[PDB]
Every structure is written in C-alpha cells, then in structure tokens.
C-alpha cells in the first residue's frame, strides 16, 4: 500500500502517517506561506492548477513522491 | 421685473456610467526528475475583478397643473 503523511489539517511538521487508500499513488507536500500541507495525493494530482484551485492558495510551491512517508517539510525549500 | 415671458418649460437630464474592470494574471512551474523519481511543482496567480454604475436623472417641470406637472416629470 502507499504510506504517506495525511495530516487533517495544516500543520508546520506533520507527523500523521497513514496507510493511503487505493484513491492515492502519491505523497504530496505544498508550503503555503504559513501553511504546510502534507497528503495522500495522485501524481496526476500533482498538478500546479489542482493544488491551487483545491487549497485556494494564490502563491505556494509543492512537491509529491512514491517512497513510504516521503511528503515531509524539508523536502521544500519553498 | 420688466420683462416677461409666460409660458412652460420642461427639462430632463439623464447620465448613465458604467465601467469594468479585471485582469488575471499566473506563473508556474512544473518539474520532474529521476537518478527514484522526484516531481516539483511551484507557483502564484492573482485576479481582480471590479464594476461601477452611475445613473442620474432630473426630470422637471414649471408649468400649469399640479397632477400633469407630476405626470410629466415621471413619464415623458
């Protein structure tokens, strides 16, 4: 299965780790200014006009990856 | 006073303005790699949006009745 943090919330260092269900292949991250985000996502998801529109965010910079928990905050520079 | 005309005058002015404005503007980059492969994505967008409207209208009558001095004013 896919191994990702999926944090509920926002949250500067996410520590929810999670099983992903079969509707995520990926780990996401975005920085946000003051927000972080890290997700179950989809590399198909991993798309700069869905990370915008869904986190309604006007300036951000995201990243996603394939290996166990990998979506974590140092992987941005931001 | 010496001078006269008798008579009626009827005025109406009507101004309409309206303008709008917006704009959208977005930059963005997408990346991937791989040695394991990594994908990157980063950017911002802005929009505005804005509308105004002005409509003025004076409708006046000096004249001889009353209810059509009132009629007049509304409905030319």
Request: charged content about 35%; glycine content about 0%; some cysteine.
């Given at each position: 299965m896919l191994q990702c943090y999926n944090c509920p919330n926002p949250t500067?260092?996410?520590?929810?780790?999670v099983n992903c269900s079969s509707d995520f292949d990926a780990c996401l991250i975005t920085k946000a200014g003051l927000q972080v985000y890290n997700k179950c996502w989809k590399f198909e998801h991993c798309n700069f006009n869905d990370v915008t529109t869904r986190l309604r965010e006007n300036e951000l910079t995201y990243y996603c990856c394939k290996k166990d928990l990998c979506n974590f905050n140092e992987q941005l520079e931001n | 006073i010496t001078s006269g005309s008798m008579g009626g005058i009827y005025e109406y002015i009507l101004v309409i303005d309206k303008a709008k404005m917006e704009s959208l503007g977005i930059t963005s980059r997408d990346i991937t790699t791989c040695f394991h492969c990594k994908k990157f994505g980063g950017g911002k967008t802005e929009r505005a949006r804005k509308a105004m409207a002005v409509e003025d209208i004076i409708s006046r009558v000096r004249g001889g009745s009353s209810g059509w001095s009132g009629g007049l004013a509304q409905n030319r």
């Open positions: 500067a260092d996410c520590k929810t780790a | -």
